Amino acid sequence: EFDAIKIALASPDMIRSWSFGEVKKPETINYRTFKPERDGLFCARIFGPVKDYECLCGKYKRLKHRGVICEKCGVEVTQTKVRRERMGHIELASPTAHIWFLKSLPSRIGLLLDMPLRDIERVLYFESYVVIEGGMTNLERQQILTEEQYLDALEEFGDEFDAKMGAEAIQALLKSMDLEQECEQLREELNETNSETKRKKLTKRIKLLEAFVQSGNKPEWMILTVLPVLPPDLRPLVPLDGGRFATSDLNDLYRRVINRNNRLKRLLDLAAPDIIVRNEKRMLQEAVDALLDNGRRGRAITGSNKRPLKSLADMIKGKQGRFRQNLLGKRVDYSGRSVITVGPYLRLHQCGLPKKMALELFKPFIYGKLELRGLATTIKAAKKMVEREEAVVWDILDEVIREHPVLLNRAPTLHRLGIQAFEPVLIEGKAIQLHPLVCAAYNADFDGDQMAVHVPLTLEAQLEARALMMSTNNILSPANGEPIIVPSQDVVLGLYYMTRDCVNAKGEGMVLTGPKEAERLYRSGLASLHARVKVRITEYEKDANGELVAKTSLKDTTVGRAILWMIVPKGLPYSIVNQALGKKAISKMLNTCYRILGLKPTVIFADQIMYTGFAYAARSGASVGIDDMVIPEKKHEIISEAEAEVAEIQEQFQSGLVTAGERYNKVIDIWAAANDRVSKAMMDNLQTETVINRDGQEEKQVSFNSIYMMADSGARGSAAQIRQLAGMRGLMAKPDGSIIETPITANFREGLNVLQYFISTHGARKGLADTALKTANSGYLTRRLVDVAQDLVVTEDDCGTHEGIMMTPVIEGGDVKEPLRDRVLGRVTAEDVLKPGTADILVPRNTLLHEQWCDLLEENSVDAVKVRSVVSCDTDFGVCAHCYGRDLARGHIINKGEAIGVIAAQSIGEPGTQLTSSIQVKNKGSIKLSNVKSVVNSSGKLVITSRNTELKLIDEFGRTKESYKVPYGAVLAKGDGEQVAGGETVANWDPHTMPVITEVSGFVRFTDMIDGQTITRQTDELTGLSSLVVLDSAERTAGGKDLRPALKIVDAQGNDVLIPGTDMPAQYFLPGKAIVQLEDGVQISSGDTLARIPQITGGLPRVADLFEARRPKEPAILAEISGIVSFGKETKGKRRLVITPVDGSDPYEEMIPKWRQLNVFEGERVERGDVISDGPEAPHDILRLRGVHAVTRYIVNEVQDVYRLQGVKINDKHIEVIVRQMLRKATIVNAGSSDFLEGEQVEYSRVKIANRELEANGKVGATYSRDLLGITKASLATESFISAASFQETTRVLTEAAVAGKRDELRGLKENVIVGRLIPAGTGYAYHQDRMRRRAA
């Protein structure tokens, strides 16, 4: 039909083009015979007829006269839905400034005229005149004149002079302004001046005038001369039942505009005084203004009730505009909801769905079926047949139901698995029975949670609900490959109670002939369900390449594991059900069954595991009671002891020995210790306290405490909640967060008295008030996310790049916190991995590192892998299938088509709610150094002279297991290659200290050092050793304010010692508080300390802030460029940093504050990307300095740090795709051949294709500076204006695209969902590619 939406300014001639006739009067209807009263806002003449094919005067009332405008009252007899499309205009008596181009924050009429907003409004309010066409008269053009000044001028200049005011003055300016002339002017002046604010304003204005000339617009189309009216059935005056009318608000706003308009025409007919027509033109400007957008300019003209009217811009804007409310999320036919409930007989491809809802939803189908089988002659007869609910409609429903998916849904639809299509089962009742393995996906309790059943009408949508959306097709979470059909709470109790083992039950140690007579020994009443036994299980292995090898052997097992083996399907080993089978073990069982036997056995085994888990959990009667909560017999003793101890601390605070805060932390640590003793006692009495006896005296195994089994299976509750029931509960903190110093010593089996309960209530309500409001935020994080990665869609099978990233195990200070297998599982290698000895050629480049390749990587101890990633992708407008990886769910590689921006945003966002002095080696290893400019101190150790020497512990395997950070000038007892073993401090330094240890030895000389100007003389009493403290700049006097104390070492001859490697003198200037150890005359030895110097947000604002990329408050100023450091002025502040490379130019200069610490030394050398101070990094800076891989590894490691601290799993692919959608823009450094401004910010894809095409020719490509935008700015500065208007503020986006004449060629998912057509993502991708080839064939 069409293929792009253009937006531009509407002209007077265009506005008269849409319209069918001026609306002259404000009458709506005739109040007695409610006719559209011509010719007011609902004019039958102008906007159409009121009933189909009937004139208004009643003369013509039949389709015989389609199209004939009547003679008597002139109403074109046509369908009355023309009433809903025909627009009308209003001929404004005076011009009137369109508010959007006058009050949008950067004012378009403002910066077009290069005129401040205040003066433009002083002209528009009819305050002050404005000059136009100054001629030869000694005035400017924009020269603002008040009454006084004009009154002076006009007495002298009746000619060659002119000064309008109000909207006509602005129209005259925009009509006389020439765009090409002033554009050349601005370019020559950009050629002239170089001031950042000046040049920025210049380039902004030049960009606007370029847009406004390149476009077809005009300036004077801003000041409205002819206003349009919306139709009459989009602003209706429908009469609600009761004789009361129910008008819209636009009827009010138009009625007011037209009244003030007609009145102004009169006030110009009577030749009125000036002040009255000025007042009327102001009132009309206000009225047109409050119509186009109300509440923008000044206060909102209030509606009749008492309220601001909802003017047009409030139609479109906000959470309830057309864009988000009626256009992205529609209400839907064929849909219903009722309470959900359990129904465990179900197979997990079906949902029990009630007869009555199903007969209501499926009435078109039933009517067609009945009149097809002939049981009902006409459609009306079929209607009354199904309304009477005869015995044939239920047969017909059971038949038009049969193979037909429905789409259950739950209200907060966080991730893409909360819409799964089931196959209905017709079930009595009024509750939608939902399968019990599905609650983990939907996140459903069965205490009232309602669900919506939509319907796939057509044939293609039944196919997509069956293939794509079915419930047996997404049993793996798209955020990480692990299963989401994990048996949940009763079923794991049933398995954990089957597959356990008492010590002396019936049938202890009797040999069974297979699983079959284990089941018979159980059901017959001869063996206990867990009484250890020898059986003959015959497992299979998939050893042969696709074949099943049989084998049998007397495994030692129990009756329970033997009864459970009758379900493990044919591929798995027996040692997978020969353990205890908690919850981790059972999700593991399903995962390995998925990875060995594919999908169908995993689904049928999921159901068999549900059924047997439910059955034996029922058979166990695992009931809970007040005697299953065993209090330790040592709890009152523990509390008495800790209480007496805290009384001792009360005394030692009353005797002045201890400070207040120290006394506090004393008491608080003592209660933490007693609490942990009570907890550990209850657990030692709770877990094993079953003592038994087999043919002998006494043994003890794990217990059968009902509450303990429920806590040990993984069914419900952790050891924390068990702790609160048995042991004393917690140390409840006051709403300050200042933890109380007397814990609620009593648990829920005893009674919390009134005090203890009232103290529990604080935290109870804080938790509830959070979890109410974490859904406010994290519903907005996902919204911004899935609105930034809207369009990012897998659009090529491969783009053939060699780029990548280096996937390695995170090592968070010593203990590794994520292996390499989880990180490089499913991603495609970019370079062929080599064997550790290099030994070989190994895994090819473009392979996919699925499970078995993680086996080859883990067996051979691979050190690290480089693997292709989305943020190093060369595809245009997409992300190819190899540079992405695989999925999670459907284990194979990503399909050419699938929409990964969305499942990426959803995965990163739906777990939002779940969120809030010396190195000591830990295990075996051989120490390995990293970036170590060490030197031997005067003691013989190893001191490192590089702040960025990370301390590794390379095991003998060939990998890293420890990674600590060694500060500058540490002192290492060990070195590189010196083997060490656990519990061994190999590093030593002091954090409060900062030494200035040099690289040469000799006499210490005070060079350019004077007491009072360079140093202080202040002897310490209790020590006596003098330190002439090196103070900073502005503290010392003025004659030496530029005189800096430098330390430089020499030999006995006086000549300056030559540094190892350099012939430069090592004179070292000291900073403020650089208190020196040894003075002049005292020679310092090797590696000798010269002088000392003195010296978190998290949860999901930390993730919100790593994604919006907000700059921190004290960034860590990176090293702009590589070379040497120097100070030249030291400041009128401040401090001045100078980086002087070895060969390149060096006009660099950075106004560092002297208030901050400076990590580097004045006489040291730093690489770019090195820190020249401390504190957090900034992501913009990381991007500017170290490429994209630096910033992307930063964003990933930070936000995965959050999600991992909270124990959630998210595959890094998704954070990398959001990071790609963050850095999609790039500023043209200097336009190489053609054709951009070198301050312009063009899409990286477009300048990339441009310089690729130009370098394809002979010319010179464009140099581009990659940017990094936050997610809100990233999504709001897009090529397509509909997908920016929908998201967030619609006023700015519409007005900017309007002036810039921007054109939307859809090519997105948000646009093709707005405009009602196939999303170009999954099944629609074929349609859109075929369409792109069907154009331009």
Partner: protein, 99 residues
């Protein structure tokens, strides 16, 4: 509650509220993303065009559904076209480049 075809809103020809007006469910943004995350671009299209808003296509869908023919005709949802007349009734001009 359940709604095969009922009474439709006035300005934007979509269904009504909940169970008192006999009104379809809300298929809001989050469910649209959950269909875009699959490939259901056919399901989603009939979900926001025929079942909901396309005021000609929805009667012509009911006719097909009774004729034993599960086709559809996509067209332009009426609420988008309300959007065009409301923007275009500002000073803006937003039209459909035809080709």
């Amino acid at each position: 509650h359940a709604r095969s075809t009922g009474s439709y809103s006035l300005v934007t020809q979509q269904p009504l509220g909940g169970k008192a007006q006999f009104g379809g469910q809300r298929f809001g943004e989050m469910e649209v993303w959950a269909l875009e995350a699959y490939g259901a671009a056919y399901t989603l299209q009939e979900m926001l065009t025929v079942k909901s808003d396309d005021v000609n296509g929805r009667t012509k869908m009911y006719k097909n559904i009774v004729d034993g023919n599960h086709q559809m005709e996509p067209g332009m949802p009426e609420s988008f076209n309300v959007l065009l007349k409301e923007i275009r009734s500002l000073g803006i001009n937003i039209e459909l480049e035809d080709e």
